[PDB]
Each structure stands twice: as C-alpha cells, then as structure tokens.
C-alpha cells in the first residue's frame, strides 16, 4: 500500500529526467536556429571516432577552448569505441582504447535522451551537442504542490495523486520568441526553431554547438 | 557482489541517466532552484 | 552550489504516513473520525456507492467510540519521565539566558525539553538547533520541518554534511491578517567548516540571503553542523520507528471494533415482542395497531400462540474481542490505562520495572544527549565553560520519599557517601523541600534559638 | 489598520465550536439535554419529521440520564493541584497588594490561579495580562477572548509582536437595566519596543485612542510584550489540545445508551401476564375485560392455556455496553467516581500515581510558569526585586502526616538539611500547623512558662 | 545427510531471508501486514486464483492484528542491559575523544554500544572497526554488511585471514539529487601483518586502490585485524543464531490466528435474527420487507414462527488458540507482556532470574568485550595505555536501592570491602546519585558546610 512512496520515487527520478529532456531539447534548437550545427551524414558511414568533432571546433572558431565537453547518445559513443577499436590508423594501443574524452581534454557524457535521437532506420539521425561554461540553465521555481483526492460516484472509491511544479529555461545568448511561441511552451514547442532568436552577436558568445551524425 | 535487496526497491525508477548536472559535465547544465515572477524573466545589456 | 531545496528526503516521505496516523491518533476521536474511510473500512461497498449507502456509513462511525488510549500512554509517559524538574549542571549565573528563555520567546528550557521529549516519544523523531544571534537560540525543529540531510565520510568520519530544515513564520504589516513565511535553513559543511544559507521569502516574493559561516567566540569557525537529531532508538541522522505505531494500530482495530458493537447494541440492545403464532384476524379485532405492554393491562392470544421476549445476549464476542484488543493494549503500554479489578504483588513488579520502563530511560538519554550538545554548542558560540550537563529525571515512578529514607539519606550526607548538593536534590525529588540550595544554606547560618 | 481590529484568526474560529462543546459538557446535564438534538440521533428520521416523532423524542431525551463524569473530573483533578495554597517566594510585605487584591476585584491571587488552572484544565487555554493603573492589575483573559497573535522570528528569535484581546465590561448608566460595552486591547511590538493601544467604539463610530509605551519605573519601556497565554500543554500561543475532549466523547456516548436503556427500562421493564390460548366468549364470560391478580382471588383458564409473566430480563448488553463505558472512563484514569467493593494491595499505585498525575504536574507547571512570569512583570512596573518566584502545588495526594513523618521532618530540621521555612511549609502541608512562621517565632521566643 | 561429506554452508546468503524477517517483525504491523504473502497463505488456492478470490484475500488480510510482541520484547531486553550506562575503567582525560564521539559524527560510545547491543538483541551478529583516519574511529558495521570472511589456522592459531564488508555513504554532488555509493573494504592478513584496500565502484567499473598497511603509533604494523564481530552466541566469526526465532514464528502464527479471528467477528459477531417458519405471502401482507425491531414497536408472526438472534458464542477453539500463543510467547520467557492477572511470589522471581536472564547477560559480555578490543586497537593506534574496560551493565532487573542497602554499602566501604569508586557507582546504580566521584570530592574537601 506504498502507493504514496513509489510515486514519489518515480516522480523525483522523472522530474530529473523531464528537466534534461526539456533542456536537451532547447539547447538543440536553440543553436540550430543559430547556425551552429554540422551535419555529418553523407560523408563515409556517418560518424567518425575523432575527425567530426574538429568540425565543430571550425564552427566555433578562434574560441575553441570553451566547449569542454560533449553530451551524446550512447549509439555514437559505441560508434567511437568500434571505430577505436579497429584502429585504421595506428594511434590506439589495447590499454587506450576506452577513452571517454575527445582527444582535447573534453569528456563525452553519455545519455539516451530522446531529444538527441530522431528517425528510424536508415533516416535515424543522433544529436552530439558540445557545451560552453553554463550555456543551458534550468531554475526550478520551488512551487511544488501535491495533494490525495478521493472520488465518489463510482463503484469503488477513486483515489488520485496529483502533482505540479514549474522551471525556467535559459539558452546562454539566446532568447525564447514568446511572440511567435507561448505563454506556456509545450516541450515540442521547445524544440522548434524561430521561436529561439539569437541575442549575442557573435556565434561565440552564444554557448553550444551541434554535431548531426547518424 | 550486490544483489539482495529491500522490499520494493525493485520498482523500476528510471532508465535513462540523468546524472546531467552542474559539476557532472563541468558546470555546462546548470540546475539551480531561485524563484521568478510571471511567464517571462528577461535581462537586458549594453550591446 | 544552492541546488533542489524545498525536497524531501524518501525515507522520510515513506514515514509522513505513519506520522500523519500518529498525529490523527494524539488528536482525539475527531481526527480518526474525520478520516474514517482510511481507517474503517465500508462493511458493504455496493450499498457503499449508492446514496443510500453512504448515510449509513456516517450513521455507522457516529455511533463508534475512539478509545484514544494512545494520547494517554503519551501523556502518562511524559509525566514520570518529567517528575519534578530536569536538573542541569555548570553555571548558573552566566547560563539564565538559556534557562529562563530558550529560544526569546519568555519560553524556558524545560518547557521546550517537556516539547521535544513528548514529540520524540509519540512519533520518534525532533531536532535542534542552535544559532547566533547578541545571544545564540536553542530552537527546535519538528519531525516533519526536517526534509533533507546527507551523510558523507570525510578523513573516515561519519559527518553530517548537508542538512535542510523549514521554519514557518508570520510577516507583520501594519494590518492584522495572517500571512505565511516558508523561510528554509540551509546548512552545509565544506572541507571541515560549517556555512548556512538562509532564504528571505518575502511575502509574495522568494528571496535568498548569502552565504556566511558563523563563527565562535574565539574564532576557528566549526568542524560539525550544530544540529542534533534525537530519535527514540538513538541520536542519528536515520528514521527511528515511532514507539506509538503498535499501539495506535491496536487502538484502530478496538475502534472499528467498537463501531461493530455499537450498531449491534443500537439494532438488537433493546428486547422486543415478537408476538408469534398470530393472525391477522386477532390483530384487527383485539389488537387493533397497538399493544398495551404495561403491568396493570394484560393481553390476550390465539390458541397456541408464544410470545418470545428476544433481544441480543452480554458477552458479545464482538465484546470478547475487544475485550481482548483492551488487554493487548494493556500488555504494551506501561500505564496507557488502568485496572481496579486486578491485585499486583509488590516486589514481583520492581523486577520487570526496568524493562517497563526500557523506553522511557532510552528517550530520556537521548533528549538529555541532545540538550546537553546544544547547550555546549551554546557555550562555544558564547565562549563559556565546556563542562557542562543537561541531565533529564531518568528516575521514574516517583513518590513522596519516605521517613526511613529520610533517615537514610541524612545519615548517608553525614558520611562522606552523597554530596550536599545530590541530597538537596533528593530531598526535593521526594516532595519534602522546594528551596534552592543557596536560599538553604544562607539561612542554615543564622543562629536560630529555636 | 488595513481592516477592522475584530479580525479573528481562522484556528481559534475553528475552535470555538470545541470550547463551546467543552463548557456545555462542563455545566451540567441541562444544557446537555437543551442540545441533544445535535448529540442523540433521533432512533428513526422518518419519524422526526413528523410532529409525533419529535414529541416522542423530546420524551425520549427526558427520560434519560447524563452521567456528568466530566465535571467531577475536572472538580476532583482541580482540588489535588488546589490543595493548602500556593507558596510565593521572595518580599511578602512588597507585595501583598498583588497577593491580597490582584485585580482590584478584593479576589486573591490564589483563588485566581484556581480560576486559571480551572479553565486551562477543562479547554486549555487562557491569558494573564498585566498592566498599570499607581498599581499593577493581573488580568484574566477567557480562551474566547484571545482573538489574534503573530509570531516572526526576529534576530533569529521567536518573538510574539502582535496580539490583541477583547475586553467586556457593563456600562455604568444610571438605570438598573444591563448594557454591554466592550473594548478592544491592540498590544504590538514593534522595533523591540512594547506599545499597547485601546479601541472603544461609540456612536457607529469605532475609535483608536493611540500609542502609548508602558515604561518601567527606572524607565527603558519594556522588550516583549507583557501578556503570557498558558495552555494545556506548553506557554504556546498556539492552540494546545483540550485535556477534556475524550472525556467527553465518551460521556456523550454513555450519555446515549442511558437514553436506550432508560427507554427499554420504561417500556418492558414490567412483567406482563400474556395469557395465550385464550377465547374472546372466555374473557367476556369470566373475565369481563378485566383481572384479579392479587393473592385472595385465582382466575380459571381454559384447556390450553398458557399463563407466562414476560419481562425484559438483566445483564442485558445495553447495560453491559453502559458499564463497559463507565469502565473504560475510569481505565482513561480519569477522577471522576470511586468503586468501594474494588481493593488495591497497597504500595501499587505509589509507582503509578507519577503516570496519574502526569497531566495533573503539567497544568501545575504552567500556571506556575505563567503567574511567576506576570508577577516578574508587575515588579519591573513598580521597580522592586524581579527574582520571585510563584509556585503552585507539585505535592499531590494530600495526606495528614504520620507522627513517623512528623518525627523525620523534625530531625531533619535540626539537621541542616531542611531549612526553617521548608519546614514551616511542610508542617502546614501535613495539617499539622497553621499559623504563620513569623507567629510562630514570636511566640516561641519567649521564655517557656513552665 | 553424513556431515563428514563434504558441504559449506557459511555465508550471510544462509541467513538473509531470517534476518528480514526479524527485520519487518521489528518494524511493526505496517511491514507485517503489508508482505501478508510469506506468513498467511491464501485459504484456498483455487479462490486465489479469481480476481474476486484476490479481493477476498484483502478483506480477509486488512482485517488482522498484528500483536507486534517482538518490538516489546527486545525493547524491554534492552532497557533492562542498558540501565544506568557503562562503566569505563581507566584514563579518561585521555580517552575523551572516543567516550563523547565515538565514529567522529556527535554519537557517543554509549549510544553507539546501544545500537550495537540492540543489533545483537534482533538478529545476532554485529560488527566493529577501527581504522586511523588525525584520530582513530570505531565504527559500526551491521549484520548485513559484512559480506565475506574466511578463516585459516597459521601456526596452530585460528586467524580470520580475510574480511569484507560494505561501506555506505550518500553521494552529495553539487546538486541534492539522492545516490548512494558503495564502498567495498577488503582486510587481509598476509604472513602475519594487518593489510587493508577499497573498492570502488563509479559509474558500475571497479576501480581498486592500492594495499596500504595501518601501523601503530611506535610502528611495527599490527599482527591482528581490527574488526571484532560479536552475536548472541560469541565474538566469532562464524554465523551467531539469532535470539528472537521463535517469538518470531510464535507471533506470526497468532498474527494468523488473529486474521482468521477477525474474519469470523466481522461476518458473525452481529446477531441475526434468522425468521423461521415464515410465508413470503405474509412478509408482503405485514412485514412489506422491512421489519421494525425497537421496543416500541412489535411484530406479529405466523403460526409455528421461531424467531432466533443468532450469533457465535464466546470462547471459541480460536480464541482459545490466540490465548495459548500468547501464553506461550510469555512462556518461552520473552518480557513481552505485562500481564496485571498474574501473581508472584517474591523471592522465586530471584530464583529463576539467572534462567530468565540467560541471553541478556550473554549479549551484555559479548559487547562488553568486543568494546573492550575496539578501545584496545585504538589505544594502539594511539599509542595509550592497554589496561582499559568497558563493561556494560551485569546486573538486571534493577530498581532503587533500599535504606537498608544504603545503610550496607555505606558500612562496607567504611570497612576495607569496597572501594570508594565502587561504592559510588553502587550507589548512583540505585538512584541515590547523579555527580561523579571526583566532584564530590572536590565539593568534600572543606569542612561540614554546617
């Protein structure tokens, strides 16, 4: 009869997992509306160990060194091991063959969101987005309410779990159209370009850059 | 070597990681807790 | 650095439903029968969705009787626990800010031990905590205001790392109406200091003050958060089980019990006719519609006709059972209710007063730990004496203290077996002086004649 | 001022209709039987809409009985914490106007006290507010009275900076017919500063008077407001839970089975002659419509008649839920009755009377607690010594002394472990002395006549 | 079935399953009602199988009683070893910071001797350690936590080689999102030194340090582990039998005596009232299908009707059983129950205290001594004194202690029989005192204050 304590647990793990989702999916769209996107599908398989991400380091130009890491699915990352793993070009050795980062002091982490993944067979393409120092930013509002109501009317007494709460998006560099989106942004809204306009400048101060490869 | 558990913990919690945040990936997603009033929080700077 | 305040640790959201049952039980009857669905289930869920269903359901818990025997065993367990008074050890001169008003609001120490002590004993779980002002404040923190706490091991010590408590507040306008502050507490220790973060909350707005580690008289800041938790089992940051969840459980089921009974003796309590053997023809020509049951008219019947005064028998098992609930009860509970009937041997009974009384000495330790922790806490940020104590009434089943032991202890302060200041407060814990020792003494040097 | 002063906070308007439950059960039977609408179920609602339904039901609720265990409770639980007086400590001639007068009424402080323990015994809460005329008034505030607190943490201490009571009193025209003024108290604390205003209403026109800072003697005005609210619990102004409301749960309850078993009792506690196998030719030959059943005359019957006295018959459950409810009363250690075929083995309830008296020590402390903090007050107003104490009986089971414990008190006495008033105070506690211990020495100090 | 053949069966997955049991049964009645399965089995299977028969099986479940004897007993078992506290024998300006923390986190030896204590009490079998971190630590390590132990005679000596237990920590990153890491420790002993590494396990990959030696102050390393488990049957590494098997099952089984009990009151426990010899022409002539039952109103019945209130009578073979559960599960010598029927003898209660208190004095010696080790080791870590005790508590069923055993002792250390200190924690043992020896002395120094 723990019916209160398992939703709480599932409820923290989702909310987590909704943050980031969302977030994933902002910051995809939101430097796609900018133009810092590369995309890797034509050229050979679709995804090389190394040589993609020198593309995106090109894009972000003479700044290079603020992007320090690389949020990725899980399909490209077995793409770098496979392709490490069959070293055509002798620059691994069997005890390095597990590297995480990206040859530049840059980790790769590592999540199954579906904001990175999209199509199926041979139109499945996979989003490896880089990262500058704080470019997406979530703040949870501390508005959570919950409440157990009963019902009456029905055969057996209806118990419910009802659950709200609130956060904020902030893409560095980029403002969300509210004009052209919402109020209330679903998380497909989210993830459509031209509500996503592009306050800073230069391509350098906005924070973040996205490889396309299948 | 862990396999025996408690009551319920079998209750599946998640499946994707999410451990996405803050110092995890070098301060790139930053999760903090403040509050803000209406739909909209805008900041304006010097061009 | 500031990340998911206002989050509740799962352990404690797997308690709020043993907590919220104890605090409906120590309520009263009122509590149980306001949620009486949760507690008492519906003997007929088809009737139960119906309209007509569900008026019998109210008619059905009115007549039950909470017993409430569980706010008693509360009650009556903080009363020996707090016989006289705590007693406290070290200056008392330099300590009256403490004493007299714990926390500024005119509200002394043992009143707030009295507090922490009953909550601690009801649902097993509080919290203290002391902070500078200039005066530092003992305060204290119900079980549920604390919702979050970590346990890290730094240099392979068991430490209290992050700890997060609530504390609700009223802003005052120049008007007269109520509002609500949840103003959070956010307390960390990095690399071996002790920082606090605290939250304005303005009234309508959410604002957070910055960080700032409090530090002691001397100096050197703190290498542990001065936050204690006291539970009945022990001192630690982990659930206790709250001693009352066998007796309130027991208590529910004698509720619902009673409710069975109750509409047994409402239908079957009062004896009825049953006029048998009858015919309708009798009844329109001699009864007509009404029967005249008194002594000074008879009535007549038919030719084989019985008429059978039934009504429902004493020693209802329903009644058996609850007779065997009330027992149960007792068998737990150290003194929840009482028994005239019964005769208990003397002598017999000290042998098992320990074990009778194994709760009550655990959550006084465990209280008089706590106190005594945020007492010396309050003297680091003070500057005063280390050594010193804030010792509960450990002794229970107290009475006035006989003359024989009167002789005793006078003769034993004669000898060099008990201080001067241990019989004082066994002369005063037998009901048999109420001066302070200086009061005593001052006036033991005046030459009275007499 | 953003509203109206008369602004009552929404948890005390949710507990008026618990404090008016509470002094209904305490006045008397009544009342109770004036409301018993609300109480009793009517035993069937198709008849209590018809007019004979409620005529029967008012003859219904008349022939019961209420038990009233509640008052004698609360009468008995009274007389053990006001037994001989309360002892003040410190300057007695300094303040024998407080003693004698206490708010100008010619009451004591002691009878006052009574009052108070009175009225935080039966629904837990009250008020003590202390003023300036040149002379200091310890008022007495009703539970209904208090109508509004706020409590902020200010400096990190829990202060209380608002609070504004109701006060009634009977304009003084020239007719001997009874008016109602009432005047509202507004006492704030603003900046660490006490200020208190009145609000008197005349002519549809409500008035603030206005602000004015109650100063001490030496001067500083005052840092917290003089106004202290005991309650059943703590010093809280929160509301503290009614010690009664069980009590009076169950009184009700009993309440209403006396109404069943009052009802059975009248209808078929008669026997009834139920002559069966009887002919309507046989009663209007031999009986005529009537019946002899003294001893001188016997009545024949027919063949086959079946004479059989009915009456409803003891030890019914009815009465055994009745006697379960008494029982249960009494198991809540409630004083309210004595049972005299009962016997207890002596020695037994000396560990147990610490569990009995458990809520008796709780609202002894508070009061204690209150009044000592209120004649702390007055002394700050009139300039004179603060270090006073007021406490009330902690000595419960009063009993006159044994000349064993007479001899003990005595030899402790010259001992020096017993000072000479502590002595004083226990030998007018035992019963055994009852003037003054001044009078006393005077007296004594005289050469022995011899 | 021949032993001599080979088998292994030592390892904690022996006794998992009776160590949650022991668990949940400690837990109270929400564990035990809520994992029903394991210790009701289903009436019928073939009913189990239908959804209405799975609805049956939770009317017949929710309806149960969980005594709940276990929680009482082993918290009287407790209560009674740990009265008063432990005594420490040996410096303790120099042993202060391990008496008042004892795992660096505000836990007390005490307290954490308590838990250590209780653990014992349940399931038997505990665990300490003591690793230099500066400042060395004793931790606790529960049942369930040791993992692995193997145990090789070298040099004719039986040594524990090996030791493995799970280390649990909650990982506070920058944010307060709740993990839990887990630390595998791993204690070697290789040609008789003391060798000791960690596993951890970041992200599911095993990543292990290197071995490293903890040496004492002076140095030459150890030539025995620190980690001591200790149970109910001895301080061996081999699995301890838990105390508390059979009150267990004793209460399980009247757990489902209690299920089955509560069925039949809840469906026969109402009376009935069973119309016989009844025509369904007159039930719509007269009755109409409703029947009234008060005493004010009668209903007639058709020739050869036998009205009959049904229900089933009282002491029945059920109730019988739970009564014989429960006096066995006092039987068996568990302090579970105070029953206020039973009468003793005093004197006899003495004679088969030794019996009664055989598990008690067993569980008392076995902590006594496995602290006794764990203060030892961390003397040699800080390079103190060896000759150091910690004994809990040897004698029970403790009480306050007479004016004539006041008397006795106070004679006794006038004599040459008992020494001072000795005489002081005899004395404090009985409830007479509450200051330490040395500050008695140093209040008795001066002359009689007179």
Same mark, same amino acid.
């Given at each position: 009869?723990?019916?209160?304590?398992?939703?709480?647990?599932?409820?923290?793990?989702?909310?987590?997992?909704?943050?980031?989702?969302?977030?994933?999916?902002?910051?995809?769209?939101?430097?796609?509306?900018?133009?810092?996107?590369?995309?890797?599908?034509?050229?050979?398989?679709?995804?090389?160990?190394?040589?993609?991400?020198?593309?995106?380091?090109?894009?972000?130009?003479?700044?290079?060194?603020?992007?320090?890491?690389?949020?990725?699915?899980?399909?490209?990352?077995?793409?770098?091991?496979?392709?490490?793993?069959?070293?055509?070009?002798?620059?691994?050795?069997?005890?390095?063959?597990?590297?995480?980062?990206?040859?530049?002091?840059?980790?790769?982490?590592?999540?199954?969101?579906?904001?990175?993944?999209?199509?199926?067979?041979?139109?499945?393409?996979?989003?490896?987005?880089?990262?500058?120092?704080?470019?997406?930013?979530?703040?949870?509002?501390?508005?959570?309410?919950?409440?157990?109501?009963?019902?009456?009317?029905?055969?057996?007494?209806?118990?419910?779990?009802?659950?709200?709460?609130?956060?904020?998006?902030?893409?560095?560099?980029?403002?969300?159209?509210?004009?052209?989106?919402?109020?209330?942004?679903?998380?497909?809204?989210?993830?459509?370009?031209?509500?996503?306009?592009?306050?800073?400048?230069?391509?350098?101060?906005?924070?973040?850059?996205?490889?396309?490869?299948? | 070597?862990?396999?025996?558990?408690?009551?319920?913990?079998?209750?599946?919690?998640?499946?994707?990681?999410?451990?996405?945040?803050?110092?995890?990936?070098?301060?790139?997603?930053?999760?903090?807790?403040?509050?803000?009033?209406?739909?909209?929080?805008?900041?304006?700077?010097?061009? | 650095?500031?990340?998911?305040?206002?989050?509740?640790?799962?352990?404690?959201?797997?308690?709020?439903?043993?907590?919220?049952?104890?605090?409906?039980?120590?309520?009263?009857?009122?509590?149980?029968?306001?949620?009486?669905?949760?507690?008492?289930?519906?003997?007929?869920?088809?009737?139960?969705?119906?309209?007509?269903?569900?008026?019998?359901?109210?008619?059905?818990?009115?007549?039950?009787?909470?017993?409430?025997?569980?706010?008693?065993?509360?009650?009556?367990?903080?009363?020996?626990?707090?016989?006289?008074?705590?007693?406290?050890?070290?200056?008392?001169?330099?300590?009256?800010?403490?004493?007299?008003?714990?926390?500024?609001?005119?509200?002394?120490?043992?009143?707030?031990?009295?507090?922490?002590?009953?909550?601690?004993?009801?649902?097993?779980?509080?919290?203290?905590?002391?902070?500078?002002?200039?005066?530092?404040?003992?305060?204290?923190?119900?079980?549920?205001?604390?919702?979050?706490?970590?346990?890290?091991?730094?240099?392979?010590?068991?430490?209290?790392?992050?700890?997060?408590?609530?504390?609700?507040?009223?802003?005052?306008?120049?008007?007269? &109406?109520?509002?609500?502050?949840? /103003?959070?507490?956010?307390?960390? @220790?990095? =690399?071996?200091?002790?920082? !606090? $973060? %605290?939250?304005?909350?303005?009234?309508?707005?959410?604002?957070?003050?910055?960080?700032?580690?409090?530090?002691?008289?001397?100096?050197?800041?703190?290498?542990?958060?001065?936050?204690?938790?006291?539970?009945?089992?022990?001192?630690?940051?982990?659930?206790?089980?709250?001693?009352?969840?066998?007796?309130?459980?027991?208590?529910?089921?004698?509720?619902?019990?009673?409710?069975?009974?109750?509409?047994?003796?409402?239908?079957?309590?009062?004896?009825?006719?049953?006029?048998?053997?009858?015919?309708?023809?009798?009844?329109?020509?001699?009864?007509?519609?009404?029967?005249?049951?008194?002594?000074?008219?008879?009535?007549?019947?038919?030719?084989?006709?019985?008429?059978?005064?039934?009504?429902?028998?004493?020693?209802?098992?329903?009644?058996?059972?609850?007779? &065997?609930?009330?027992?149960?009860? /007792?068998?737990?509970?150290?003194? @929840?209710? =009482?028994?005239?009937?019964? !005769? $208990? %041997?003397?002598?017999?009974?000290?042998?098992?007063?320990?074990?009778?009384?194994?709760?009550?000495?655990?959550?006084?330790?465990?209280?008089?730990?706590?106190?005594?922790?945020?007492?010396?806490?309050?003297?680091?940020?003070?500057?005063?004496?280390?050594?010193?104590?804030?010792?509960?009434?450990?002794?229970?089943?107290?009475?006035?203290?006989?003359?024989?032991?009167?002789?005793?202890?006078?003769?034993?302060?004669?000898?060099?077996?008990?201080?001067?200041?241990?019989?004082?407060?066994?002369?005063?814990?037998?009901?048999?002086?109420?001066?302070?020792?200086?009061?005593?003494?001052?006036?033991?040097?005046?030459?009275?004649?007499?």
């Amino acid at each position: 009869q723990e019916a209160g304590a398992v939703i709480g647990q599932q409820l923290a793990g989702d909310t987590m997992q909704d943050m980031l989702n969302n977030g994933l999916a902002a910051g995809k769209a939101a430097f796609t509306a900018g133009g810092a996107v590369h995309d890797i599908s034509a050229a050979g398989t679709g995804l090389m160990t190394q040589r993609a991400f020198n593309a995106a380091q090109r894009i972000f130009g003479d700044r290079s060194t603020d992007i320090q890491v690389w949020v990725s699915h899980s399909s490209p990352l077995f793409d770098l091991y496979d392709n490490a793993l069959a070293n055509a070009e002798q620059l691994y050795v069997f005890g390095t063959v597990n590297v995480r980062a990206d040859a530049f002091g840059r980790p790769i982490i590592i999540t199954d969101s579906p904001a990175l993944v999209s199509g199926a067979a041979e139109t499945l393409r996979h989003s490896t987005l880089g990262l500058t120092t704080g470019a997406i930013l979530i703040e949870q509002n501390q508005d959570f309410d919950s409440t157990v109501v009963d019902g009456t009317g029905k055969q057996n007494i209806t118990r419910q779990y009802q659950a709200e709460w609130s956060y904020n998006l902030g893409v560095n560099g980029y403002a969300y159209d509210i004009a052209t989106g919402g109020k209330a942004p679903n998380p497909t809204a989210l993830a459509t370009a031209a509500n996503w306009d592009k306050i800073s400048t230069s391509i350098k101060d906005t924070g973040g850059v996205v490889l396309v490869t299948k | 070597v862990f396999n025996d558990w408690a009551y319920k913990t079998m209750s599946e919690v998640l499946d994707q990681q999410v451990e996405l945040f803050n110092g995890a990936t070098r301060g790139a997603i930053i999760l903090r807790s403040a509050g803000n009033t209406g739909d909209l929080s805008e900041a304006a700077f010097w061009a | 650095d500031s990340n998911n305040i206002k989050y509740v640790r799962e352990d404690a959201k797997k308690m709020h439903k043993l907590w919220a049952h104890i605090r409906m039980a120590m309520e009263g009857s009122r509590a149980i029968k306001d949620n009486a669905k949760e507690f008492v289930p519906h003997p007929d869920n088809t009737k139960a969705t119906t309209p007509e269903g569900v008026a019998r359901y109210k008619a059905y818990i009115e007549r039950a009787v909470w017993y409430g025997a569980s706010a008693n065993t509360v009650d009556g367990m903080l009363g020996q626990i707090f016989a006289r008074d705590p007693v406290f050890t070290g200056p008392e001169d330099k300590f009256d800010m403490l004493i007299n008003d714990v926390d500024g609001s005119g509200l002394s120490i043992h009143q707030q031990a009295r507090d922490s002590a009953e909550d601690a004993l009801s649902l097993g779980r509080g919290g203290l905590f002391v902070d500078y002002s200039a005066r530092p404040y003992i305060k204290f923190i119900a079980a549920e205001d604390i919702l979050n706490w970590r346990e890290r091991w730094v240099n392979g010590a068991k430490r209290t790392t992050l700890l997060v408590f609530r504390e609700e507040s009223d802003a005052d306008d120049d008007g007269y &109406q109520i509002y609500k502050e949840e /103003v959070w507490r956010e307390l960390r @220790l990095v =690399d071996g200091t002790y920082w !606090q $973060r %605290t939250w304005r909350e303005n009234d309508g707005q959410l604002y957070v003050d910055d960080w700032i580690s409090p530090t002691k008289a001397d100096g050197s800041q703190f290498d542990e958060i001065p936050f204690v938790i006291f539970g009945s089992k022990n001192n630690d940051p982990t659930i206790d089980m709250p001693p009352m969840r066998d007796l309130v459980e027991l208590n529910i089921a004698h509720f619902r019990n009673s409710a069975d009974y109750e509409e047994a003796c409402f239908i079957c309590g009062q004896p009825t006719l049953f006029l048998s053997g009858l015919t309708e023809h009798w009844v329109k020509n001699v009864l007509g519609g009404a029967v005249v049951i008194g002594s000074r008219d008879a009535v007549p019947l038919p030719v084989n006709a019985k008429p059978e005064l039934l009504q429902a028998e004493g020693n209802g098992m329903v009644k058996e059972a609850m007779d &065997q609930k009330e027992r149960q009860m /007792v068998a737990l509970g150290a003194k @929840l209710i =009482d028994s005239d009937k019964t !005769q $208990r %041997t003397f002598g017999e009974a000290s042998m098992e007063a320990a074990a009778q009384n194994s709760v009550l000495s655990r959550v006084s330790k465990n209280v008089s730990d706590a106190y005594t922790k945020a007492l010396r806490w309050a003297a680091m940020f003070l500057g005063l004496d280390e050594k010193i104590e804030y010792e509960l009434n450990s002794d229970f089943d107290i009475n006035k203290m006989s003359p024989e032991e009167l002789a005793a202890v006078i003769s034993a302060w004669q000898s060099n077996a008990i201080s001067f200041t241990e019989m004082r407060w066994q002369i005063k814990k037998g009901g048999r002086a109420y001066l302070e020792d200086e009061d005593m003494r001052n006036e033991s040097e005046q030459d009275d004649p007499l």
